[PDB]
Amino acid sequence: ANRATSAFLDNPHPVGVNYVDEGSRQFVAVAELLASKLIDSSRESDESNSDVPFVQAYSKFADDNPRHLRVKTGGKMANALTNVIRSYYSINAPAIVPQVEIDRLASKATVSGDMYNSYAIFNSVPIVEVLSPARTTVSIVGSDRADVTMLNTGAGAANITFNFGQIAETVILKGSVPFQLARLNQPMPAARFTYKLRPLDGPFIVVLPVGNPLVISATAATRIQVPLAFNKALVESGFQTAMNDGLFDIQNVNYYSSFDEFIISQYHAQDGINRVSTCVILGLALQAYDQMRRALPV
Amino acid sequence: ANRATSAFLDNPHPVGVNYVDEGSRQFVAVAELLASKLIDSSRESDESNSDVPFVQAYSKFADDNPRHLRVKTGGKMANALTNVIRSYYSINAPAIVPQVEIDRLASKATVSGDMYNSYAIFNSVPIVEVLSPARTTVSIVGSDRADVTMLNTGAGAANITFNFGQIAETVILKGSVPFQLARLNQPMPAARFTYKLRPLDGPFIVVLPVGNPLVISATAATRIQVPLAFNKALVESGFQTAMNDGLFDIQNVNYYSSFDEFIISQYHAQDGINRVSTCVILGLALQAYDQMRRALPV
Amino acid sequence: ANRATSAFLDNPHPVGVNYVDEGSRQFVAVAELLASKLIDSSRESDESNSDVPFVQAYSKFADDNPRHLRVKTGGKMANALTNVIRSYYSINAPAIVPQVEIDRLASKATVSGDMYNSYAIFNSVPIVEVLSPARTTVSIVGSDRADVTMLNTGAGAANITFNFGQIAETVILKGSVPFQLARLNQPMPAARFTYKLRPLDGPFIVVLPVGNPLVISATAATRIQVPLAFNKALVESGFQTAMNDGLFDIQNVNYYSSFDEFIISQYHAQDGINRVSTCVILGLALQAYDQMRRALPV
Amino acid sequence: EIDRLASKATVSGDMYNSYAIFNSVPIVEVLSPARTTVSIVGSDRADVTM
Amino acid sequence: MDVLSKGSLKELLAHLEKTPLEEAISYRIGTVPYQNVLISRNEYYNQLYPDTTSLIDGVSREGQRNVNGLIMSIISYVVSGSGHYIPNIGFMLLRRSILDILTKHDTGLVTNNLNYGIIARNLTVSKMNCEQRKRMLICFKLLAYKDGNQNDYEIYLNQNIPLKQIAPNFIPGDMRTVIHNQDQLAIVGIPAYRLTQSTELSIRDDNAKSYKLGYVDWYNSNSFLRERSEFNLIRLKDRDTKYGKLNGW
Amino acid sequence: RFGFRDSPFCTSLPRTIMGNDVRRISYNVFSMMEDIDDVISEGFILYDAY
Known part of the structure; x- marks a missing residue:
């Protein structure tokens, strides 16, 4: 018997346990609101032939007046936001930022800080295990779209067990050629191209005929509670910037291609219900x- | 000979035939406009620490004042919007909403209700058929980017026929190694990495050498007329929510990974132009x- | 040794050298601003009983009053923008638009022509070369996510060299089964699923055992300076449109599946630093x- | 004491306003095979004799 | 001097219409074009100053009797102010205007075999300044339109990147394009900087400064025409008009 | 030094009082604040103005 699993699901590292309180969550919401004001003020200042709207927005964000002969780093809010991002990723990262500074920065705006008033759909495909007998080869490639290539070299039909976990809501399976799939202790239907599956239904069995290899493309959808201000396009761009800037560079961590892969991997681990609460705040x-750095490149 | 076809193009199910009149189209446009205001008021209420902006928007949308200790579902507009989505998907889905309710809800805001003002670009690549000789094997994987893996086990070179249909506007072919491709009754050029093709031109021939397998990656662009308010990001998110909430599950319907696959498959079926018009209203x-459900998670 | 390379990186064609001055960059920024207002004014007029907002917006954009029986084409600004887009793609394209028309159209709005105040992340994977020994097969497929399928039919283990260039900032490597990767002339670490690599570190050596195929999935992030108004979603749809209406049909040029591939391919040329400045203005x-044609389809 | 002295004049403490060019040659390593002699002399101008 | 003062495409083409070919041709023997020579520059150095003579100097040189020399003499007149020594051309050709030679088939001169790359190299395009290159490109476009060689002109611009950026934009058959053009083609003019009666080192720079200093004297001379003060005394035929059109354009 | 009652003069404005850091607010930021009554309950230092 052979075991094949998705690469991104292997060994999720523990996430930080700091800056998860109500006051800390307000600071993240304030930072997002004020950063979005910076981008809008920059575009307002270009049309009006004046730098005043950008100056006032920067002063609110950085608590300091801009100067021509000084670098626009972003102030204390930029430094605090960078350090909290480091703390969320790993439990080994130190919690440098004091609590007094967090509370002072949260008084700038009047946002609630709730992180459960909306939802977002994530497209990472969880394949916990693929069980194949001897004389068959199985390979899994891809995260947003998982392509599983199974080849049967023996003389008889082989049954392959698919386990998609219990978290994903729906999984859509498309094959290169029509194939047969059924649940445990269920009759095999006629071969067809597309199957819609519920991962909670149970392990699934695919009849693999001898001959040309069969490839199955898997797409999944998962619902995770997120703030109303959540925007997946900005979050994904910010994830790459944080990784390039070295905010995630710390010993004993696992890296991912996208924030979608990171949040799904943690959600499939044990005590993953508590992990995604911290991951959403990180998002x-x-x-x-992403918004602050694009307005103030360094 | 062996024939290979894309999975998502197989067996498109008939779409519904109700709620396609001028008044029904105005209802969907009004719902889109009111849902956009619902999610804007929700963000404003969070940033202003006052529920007045949300109460005003919900009352217009739901026809009742928001009240605590109630679910805040969305009123009669939410029920009508949910039911019309069910009817559009399948001809077997019943039409429940009376025309009187549709007309009353369409009077909330003034909209044109025209679904053909603008256009959108859809990136699903249609491979209608791939015809190969006996010795060669061809496999097709993917919908947004299709990878065609071909291997020649015969004595000499083989000719593989590619048919991309007639609806797609542009198809771009890239190969792992330089390959030879030309139209019917045209001289074969030197081997190149990439080709730009018009599917209307005709079937295309690929020379497959005997040495090593050749993988061709295909990308396509298709133009479909849509209303000006169309936003592909919101439509794709709404499609996944519709599948998760279980309002697409009826007897004898195909399932798709994205709204792109759904609309392209209906285009290539018989009476595709009329089918696509209904699918635009569903989009x-x-x-x-998506906007209303994210504002009011139920 | 056998050499494998990414298809989209092969022979980037020279871009145009016209309309790259500060006066012409202002015109491109002005056109983007006036196109954005054309979309917004059309939606406002749609949701109202008056056409005055659309008449005023179109009159400023097209220098002519709209007529009921005449097609709304955009006037001189549309013609200037269409021809200017043609010049940027290829050096072989002529420079038709006079400088006087460009300067006059740039005076319609007040926006700075700055093209370096922000940045953007592009996701193409620049696999410049993969060097493999004899009795091994290497296949590179994909641009946004690069999959390398490698097989070892030899007696012993083989070392494969991966070159990712020097432009990309971060490359994330994921494998179907754990594998060993290290820099040149460095001790090889323990087998693991994921690797985070800086392409500047050097060519990377991968140990390929003789047992089973190993597929490595690569994702890369690169940062290019762009104007703050840059929106990746609108650029990609605009790229697909301009290719469909034949704006890129010119002799002796290459064709790309996306603007992400186009900009990364030119960046890796000998004069890539000089080429990306022109490609940014093209974006x-x-x-x-995209915005102008969606509001005024022809 | 540092804070009291810093209040005597008002000047930005920014240390990233400008740049300076430094002329030291960083020869990290020079790898040579057997039967060859290599000597590195100098910092401003590095002289490698092989 | 008068040809170097023109600063707009309309003025340059208008001057070429009224100027015969004999002004381009010089009747002084000059010297052979490409030679390494030593000249005297006593304001700067005691020793003789090396330099290389060229065809785009302001002093007449000896020219080849072929058609290539005639076109190369026209361009040198436009960009440098003086032509070359090509005698016995003939009355019929010499009486025609410079624009007629460059644009009209009725002159009797055949120029379709000309190579723009060889002509540019012989004229030392590398030594030319921005205004000089723009003026030469105008001559090339007029020749291309006469011979139906528009495609060849565009390809030659594609090979030379710096020439494509500064290429003037006008259709050689439409007068509306000439009026709209705003390229500055002046080589001599009233100087905003401080201009002194001092020598220059190279032959080209020294000869150019002579025209610049001569133009200042010409500007204040009685021969100069002051449009602001003496517009009524100008003849109606040659008076400035807003609706000024070249014949056939 | 001068024997004043409740002297309003400090040798240097303190960075910390009773072991606790003193809040520093720029005048421009202080102008746009909405919770000055709460802010004034604990001392603050104002700068960036004459």
Whole structure:
């Protein structure tokens, strides 16, 4: 018997346990709101032939007046936002930022800080295990779209067990050629191209005929509670910027291609219900990082 | 000879035939406009620490004042919007909403209701058929980017015929190694990495050498007329929510990974032009569904 | 040794050298601003009983009053933008638009022509070369996510060299089964699923055992300076449109599946630093073409 | 004491306003095979004799 | 001097219409074009100053009797102010205007075999300044339109990147394009900087400064025409008009 | 030094009082604040103005 699993699901590292309180969550929401004001003020200042709207927005964000002969780093809010991002990713990262500074920065705006008033759909495909007998080869490639190539070299039909976990809501399976799939202890239907599956239904069995290899493309959807201000496009861009800037560079961590892969991997681990609560706060912080850095490149 | 076809193009199911009149189209446009205001008021209420902006928007949308200790579902507009999405998907889905309710809800805001003002670009690549000789094997994987893997086990070179249909506007072919491709009754050029093709031109021939397998990656662009308010990001999110909430599950319907696959498959079926017109109204309805459901998670 | 390379990186064609001055960059920025207002004014007029907002917006954009029986084409600004887009793609394309028309159209709005105040992340994977020994097969497929399928039919283990260039900032490597990767002349670490690599570190050596195929999935992030108004979603749709209406049909040029591939391919040329500046101006012009054509289809 | 002295004049403490060019040659390593002699002399101008 | 003062495409083409070919041709023997020579520059150095003579100097040189020399003499007149020594051309050709030679088939001169790359190299395009290159490109476009060689002109611009950026934009058959053009083609003019009666080192720079200093004297001379003060005394035929059109354009 | 009652003069404005850092607010930021009554409950230092 052979075991094949998705690469991104292997060994999720523990996430930080700091800056998860109500006051800390307000600071993240304030940072996102004020960073979005910076981008809008920059575009307002270009049309009006004046730098005043950008100056006032920067002063609110950085608590300091811009100067021509000084670099626009972003102030204390930029430094605090960078450090909290580091703390969320790994439990080994130190919690440098004091609590007094967090509370002072949260008084700038009047946002609620709730992180459960909306939802977002994530497209990473979880394949916990693929069980194949001897004389068959199985390979899994891809995260947003998982292509599983199974080849049967023996003389008889082989049954392959698919386990998609219990978290994903729906999984859509498309094959290169029509194939047969059924649940445990269920009759095999006629071969067809497309199957819609519920991962909670149970392990699934695919009849693999001898001959040309069969490839199955898997697409999944998962619902995760997110703030109303959540924007997946900004979060993904902020994730790459944080990774390039070295905010995630710390020993004993696992890296991912996208924030979608990161949040799904943690959600499939044990105590993953508590992990995604911290990951969602990280995502909103990454949204603030992307907006702030694009307005103030360094 | 062996024939290979894309999976998502197989067996498109008939779409519904109700709620396609001028008044019904105005209802979907009004719902989209009101749903956009619902999600804007929700963000404003969070940033202003006052529920007045949300109460005003919900009352217009739902026809009742928001009240605590109630579910805040969305009123009669939410029920009508949910039911029309069910009817559009399948001809077997019953039409429940009376025309009187549709007309009353369409009077909330003034909209044109025209679904053909603008256009959108859809990136699903249609491979209608691939014809190969006996010795060669051809496999097709993917919908947004299709990878065609071909291997020649015969004595000499083989000719593989590619048919991309007639609806797609532009198809771009890239190969792992330089390959030879030319139209019917045209001289074969030197081997190149990439080709730009018009599917209307005709079937295309690929020379497959005997040495090593050749993988061709295909990308396509298709133009479909849509209303000006169309937003592909919101429509794709709404499509996944519709599948997760289980309003697409009826007897004898195909399932798709994205709204791109759904609309392209209906285009290539018989009476594709009339089918696509209905699917456009479903797309705008799904855009309204995503905004309202994210504002009021139920 | 056998050499494998990414298809989209092969022979980038020279871009145009016209309309790259500060006066012409202002015109591109002005066109983007006026195209954005054309979209917004059309929606406002749709949701109202008056056409005055659309008449005023179109009159400023097209220098002519709209007529009921005449097609709304955009006037001189549309013609100037269409021809200017043609010049940027290829050096072989002529420079038709006079400088006087460009300067006059740039005076319609007040926006700075700055093209370096922000940045953007592009996701193409630049696999410049993969060097493999004899009795091994290497296949590279994909641009946004690069999959390398490698097989070892030899007696012993083989070392494969991966070159990712020097432009990309971060490359994430994921494998179907754990594998060993290290820099040149460095001790090889323990087998693991994921690797985070800086392409500047050097060519990377991968140990390929003789047992089973190993597929490595690569994702890369690169940062290019762009104007703040840059929107990746609008540029990609504008790129697909301009290719469909034949704006890129010119002799002795290459064709790319996306603007992400186009900009990365030119960046890796010998004069890539000089080429990306012209491609950035092309991206903003493609952004204006998308909005203008969606509001005024022809 | 540092804070009291810093209040005597008002000047930005920014240390990233400008740049300076430094002329030291960083020869990290020179790898040579057997039967060859290599000597590196100098910092401003590095003289490698092989 | 008068040809170097023109600063707009309309003025340059208008001057070429009224100027015969004999002004381009010089009747002084000059010297052979490409030679390494030593000249005297006593304001700067005691020793003799090396330099290389060229065809785009302001002093007449000896020219080849072929058609290539005639076109090369026209361009040198436009960009440098003086032509070359090509005698016995003939009354019929010499009486025609410069524009007629460059644009009209009725002159009797055949120029379709000309190579723009060889002509540019012989004229030392590398030594030319921005205004000089723009003026030469105008001559090339007029020749291309006469011979139906528009495609060849565009390809030659594609090979030379710096020439494509500064290429003037006008259709050689439409007068509306000439009026709209705003390229500055002046080589001599009233100087905003401080201009002194001092020598220059190279032959080209020294000869150019002579025209610049001569133009200042010409500007204040009685021969100069002051449009602001003496517009009524100008003849109606040659008076400035807003609706000024070249014949056939 | 001068024997004043409740002297309003400090040798240097303190960075910390009773072991706690003193809040520093720029005048421009202080102008746009909405919770000055709460802010004034604990001392603050104002700068960036004359």
